[PDB]
Design a protein around this ligand. Sequence first.
Ligand SMILES: C=C1C[C@]23C[C@H]1CC[C@H]2[C@@]12CC[C@H](O)[C@@](C)(C(=O)O1)[C@H]2[C@@H]3C(=O)O
Lengths: 60, 339
Amino acid sequence: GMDELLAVLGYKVRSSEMADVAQKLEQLEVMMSNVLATETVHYNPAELYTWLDSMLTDLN
Amino acid sequence: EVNLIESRTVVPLNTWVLISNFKVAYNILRRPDGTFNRHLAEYLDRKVTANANPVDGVFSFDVLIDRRINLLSRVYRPAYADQEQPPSILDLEKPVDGDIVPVILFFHGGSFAHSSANSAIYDTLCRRLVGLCKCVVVSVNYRRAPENPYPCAYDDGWIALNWVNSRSWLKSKKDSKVHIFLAGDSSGGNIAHNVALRAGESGIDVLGNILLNPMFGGNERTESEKSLDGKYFVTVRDRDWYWKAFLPEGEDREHPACNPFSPRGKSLEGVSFPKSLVVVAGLDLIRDWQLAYAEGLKKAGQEVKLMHLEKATVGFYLLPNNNHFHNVMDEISAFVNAE
Ligand SMILES: C=C1C[C@]23C[C@H]1CC[C@H]2[C@@]12CC[C@H](O)[C@@](C)(C(=O)O1)[C@H]2[C@@H]3C(=O)O
């Protein structure tokens, strides 16, 4: 079950995973506040879950 | 230090995810030295093409309004009645049918540096406007800073306004005139204000302006800026960054492009200016500047309707899942369709 209100905006997020994505966004802000983008261009920007997961790894 | 629990308490979770995702991505795009990662920006942005096929009662098409700068605008129209086949490239400019057909010339937000007319968030917003206001929408793909700073955005809006006003197929039957309403969120609202000023000085009559969480500022640090800094998706630091990227080199925030009511700005007292609908999100850190803008118009004797949404944040109008969205869309329709 994908969130249709986000899908129309170009983002693919399963409604059941919304909280997990929200958690990843915060975890990413945390890392950024402690701090590259070259590897970012390789990731799929529509898949927020995997995108954030990939970014979190690039940092840390 | 980072704790975003507070911002999650005021918005639906999916909305929080959408705005927060932009927030983190934009952190990466803005560089400390004032440069911008345009390539990554345009790669990350979610875009959509135009479509002559009516979807949910709306179809669209792109138009090149100025070749020298490759200025595009996307036109959104309600599906043609009794059409047996989809619109061909020769059926896109069919004369509007109706005594009065409002045309909203829209300018997207993004703080002067982000987004395009074909960004999914704005293509969706424009399609919703067509259906909720029963009108035609023309979204301008204005040039972005820092590459194309002031006055590029305003100049592009001026060109688009003249294009719209000169379309014979957009004329309302009532008075044989194109009924134009300027609209925009964030930086787009700022552009609407300035395009309106130029229109009034050139004879083009704009019937009304719709500003959603308009982007204005000034040298002073308002109370809302100090108290809300970083609490609801936006920081004074990034606000300063966008103003510096958009304004001329060496200028400060009292330049009229930033502060329309700066001592440097021309008075609006006794000036032919369209009626305005100003929407202010209570949790937008620049709330005080926006409220000051609405008060400035009122003080200048201009017609202004203020909608101060106490618990709304930036981007509340991107998802139809909250009362701020519903209430605002209702007022926009009433505004453009009012006598
Ligand atoms: C740096 C920015 C730019 C923000 C504020 C902050 C984080 C979220 C951005 C967007 C992203 C989406 C919308 O265009 C916007 C109009 C919205 O609602 O959120 C933006 C806003 C702005 O330009 O004022």
